[PDB]
Amino acid sequence: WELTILHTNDVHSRLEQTSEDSSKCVDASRCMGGVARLFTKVQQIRRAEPNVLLLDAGDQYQGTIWFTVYKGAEVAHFMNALRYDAMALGNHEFDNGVEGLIEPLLKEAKFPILSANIKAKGPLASQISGLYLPYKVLPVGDEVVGIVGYTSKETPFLSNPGTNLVFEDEITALQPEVDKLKTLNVNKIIALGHSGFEMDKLIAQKVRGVDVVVGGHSNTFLYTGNPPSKEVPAGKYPFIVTSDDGRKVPVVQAYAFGKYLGYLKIEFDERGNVISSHGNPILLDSSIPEDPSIKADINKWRIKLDDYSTQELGKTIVYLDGSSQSCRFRECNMGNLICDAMINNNLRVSMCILNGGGIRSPIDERNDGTITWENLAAVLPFGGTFDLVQLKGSTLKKAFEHSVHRYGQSTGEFLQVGGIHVVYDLSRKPGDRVVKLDVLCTKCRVPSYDPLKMDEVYKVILPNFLANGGDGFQMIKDELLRHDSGDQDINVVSTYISKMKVIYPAVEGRIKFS
């Protein structure tokens, strides 16, 4: 028995087609993704293959003005139009709190929304009762396929799920659900969830009975053969895990931003065991037409977004590299721009720290360099503030150690900086990777870079998200000596752009590796 799994993850409000770097589509002839194009490709597959599931591994929420304005109503509407079979809850589904998940998405989705490791307590349990499920058993032809969901345990430190939701360990929560499905004689099981490639591999290895893992969160690009675009594969597609019960378990992911449609054909035997699997993510480029009906509908919804001040904030003469591949791995010029905008606005303190996880998109310079509120809103969508903090040198050294504690998983804690020169030696044990850390002096008439002192006290401008233990920066929350509330993130950056008129941030050597 053959099953085709079509899968998307981390779409992040890319409802319209985008540039290849997934920023605003300007040169339409080279644009990719969008729901209109995705619908065309899905329909081509559903008409050719009999047993097809369309799955989403979370993080449909947040990324563009579509979400800022429609707050999830666009997600329900277009996922319904595309007829998704199931979606796993991602961390970003909680960005507008539980009330922002329940009302526009859980109540309007015409498909099951899943998460086996999220448990509701207090008065909320009765409200959210049955709105999301641990699993769904779906009929596929004359067969039945069990889909069991999971959401990152880290969501309380990355989003706003509230206090009445408990995030259990994925493996611990999944095992009883898979076991229940086996007693219900459901012999084919897909674990669909949002915890990142490393947890996906662990789930594949340790949850007895899982046949396939469809993930997200890490924006992992997997490919078999020569890749069709700029994304570099982390491994083959599918990635094969050898389980503890001795089975070969395919693990798949499809990058992010709706640029690819994941495609895996699985051959099961009569007893539900995977004989083989093959596929590859499909590049949703210009050669695939945008469905006319979906595109007409997208255009209808776009009208309300066309009200956003098309007025130029200023110009960039350089590519503003706010891509995750850069900003979560190394010094990125968009990170330097925001940290210098933060420092500047405050003076109008010379040290700044900014988590890569909060830099959500690049901005392209080829449109006569024009930066609009729409371009910027995709970079900084969270509506947070840039706050002032007084920190011990030891607290800062610990924050920098945390910044690279699990380097290489495309996690959000990597720090972008201002007034700091940090050198990392990744070959060293986690918690001992910071080999050099120089900071801009304050008790000096002429600023210069001097080695950080553990027993010294520094004034730093950082997002309120980091002062509140976001991205696992518990040491900042627990050890800070002062915390003053600041100005709105996006307004700080637009004003600075309007003041500078022409911007050109560079990669200068603020962050180095040894």
The answer to the question of whether 329 is labelled as a binding residue is: no
Choose which of 449, 451, 482, 484 interacts with a copy of itself (CB under 8 A): 449
Q: Contacts with ligand O1Q in 213-232 (CB under 6 A)? A: none
At residue 34, the 3 state secondary structure works out as coil
Q: Which stretch binds ligand O1Q (CB under 6 A): 193-201, 228-236, 274-282, 460-468?
A: 460-468
With CB under 5 to 8 Å by kind, the binding choice for 51 among Zn ion, a copy of itself, ligand O1Q, none is none
With CB under 5 to 8 Å by kind, the binding choice for 319 among Zn ion, a copy of itself, ligand O1Q, none is a copy of itself
Shorter beta-carbon distance to ligand O1Q: residue 325 or 464: 464
Q: Quick one: three-class SS letters along 381-433? A: CCCCEEEEEEEEHHHHHHHHHHCCCCCCCCCCCCEEEECEEEEECCCCCCCCC
Of 65, 84, 85, the residue nearest 15 (C-alpha): 65
Extract the tokens encoding 421.
């020169």
Choose which of 345, 355, 403, 416 interacts with ligand O1Q (CB under 6 A): 355
Longest alpha-carbon distance in the chain: 78
In this structure, the number of other CB atoms found within 10 A of the CB of residue 319 comes to 17
Q: Contacts with Ca ion in 182-201 (CB under 5 A)? A: 187
Q: Which stretch binds Zn ion (CB under 5 A): 108-116, 214-222, 472-480, 501-509?
A: 214-222
Q: Say how far apart CA 4 and CA 442 lie, in whole Å.
A: 61
Residue 272 is a binding residue for Ca ion (CB under 5 A):
yes
Choose which of 421, 460, 465, 472 interacts with a copy of itself (CB under 8 A): 421
Residue 244 is a binding residue for a copy of itself (CB under 8 A):
no
Of 360, 146, 337, the residue nearest 256 (C-alpha): 360
Residue 217 is a binding residue for Zn ion (CB under 5 A):
yes
Of 107, 105, 108, 124, the residue nearest 58 (C-alpha): 105
Shorter beta-carbon distance to a copy of itself: residue 351 or 466: 351
Choose which of 43, 51, 160, 325 interacts with ligand O1Q (CB under 6 A): 160
Choose which of 177, 211, 340, 387 interacts with Ca ion (CB under 5 A): 211
The answer to the question of whether 91 is labelled as a binding residue is: yes
With CB under 5 to 8 Å by kind, the binding choice for 59 among Zn ion, ligand O1Q, Ca ion, none is Zn ion
Residue type, 375: N
Q: Say how far apart CA 330 and CA 507 lie, in whole Å.
A: 9
Q: What is the DSSP letter of 358?
A: G
Q: Say how far apart CA 175 and CA 272 lie, in whole Å.
A: 18
Shorter beta-carbon distance to ligand O1Q: residue 52 or 158: 158
Q: Say how far apart CA 313 and CA 321 lie, in whole Å.
A: 18
Residue 476 is a binding residue for ligand O1Q (CB under 6 A):
no
Q: Say how far apart CA 220 and CA 338 lie, in whole Å.
A: 26
- Residue 43, H or E segment: helix 35-48
* Per-residue interface string for the shown chain with ligand O1Q, residues 377-416, x marking contact by CB under 6 A: -----x-x---------------------------x----
Smallest distance from the beta carbon of 216 to ligand O1Q, in angstroms? 11
- Strand order, beta sheet including 370-371: 370-371, 314-316, 502-503
Q: Say how far apart CA 153 and CA 175 lie, in whole Å.
A: 16
With CB under 5 to 8 Å by kind, the binding choice for 382 among Zn ion, a copy of itself, ligand O1Q, none is ligand O1Q
Residue 114 contacts by C-beta under 8 Å, 6 or more apart in sequence?
A: 86, 87, 88, 89, 132, 133, 134, 135, 136, 147, 148, 149, 192, 193
Smallest distance from the beta carbon of 160 to ligand O1Q, in angstroms? 3
Q: What is the DSSP string of 88-99?
A: EPPGGGGTTTTH
* Contact between 332 and 388 (Cβ < 8 Å): no
* Per-residue interface string for the shown chain with ligand O1Q, residues 88-117, x marking contact by CB under 6 A: ---x---x----------------------
With CB under 5 to 8 Å by kind, the binding choice for 272 among ligand O1Q, a copy of itself, Ca ion, none is Ca ion
* Contact between 80 and 110 (Cβ < 8 Å): yes
* Contact between 350 and 443 (Cβ < 8 Å): no
Residue 502 is a binding residue for a copy of itself (CB under 8 A):
yes
Extract the tokens encoding 334.
């968009």
Q: Which stretch binds ligand O1Q (CB under 6 A): 185-193, 198-206, 438-446, 458-466?
A: 458-466
* Per-residue interface string for the shown chain with a copy of itself, residues 293-332, x marking contact by CB under 8 A: ------------------------xxx-x-----------
Residue 350 is a binding residue for a copy of itself (CB under 8 A):
yes
Q: Say how far apart CA 263 and CA 417 lie, in whole Å.
A: 39
The answer to the question of whether 333 is labelled as a binding residue is: no
Q: Which residues bind Zn ion (CB under 5 A)?
A: 10, 59, 90-91, 217
Q: Which residues bind a copy of itself (CB under 8 A)?
A: 317-319, 321, 333, 347-348, 350, 365, 421, 440, 445-449, 499, 501-502, 504-509
Q: Which residues bind Ca ion (CB under 5 A)?
A: 187, 211, 272
Q: Which residues bind ligand O1Q (CB under 6 A)?
A: 91, 95, 157-160, 355, 357-358, 382, 384, 412, 463-465, 468, 470-471
Q: What residues form the annotated binding site?
A: 10, 12, 59, 91, 194, 217, 328, 355, 360, 382, 465, 471
Q: What residues form the annotated binding site for Zn(2+)?
A: 10, 12, 59, 91, 194, 217
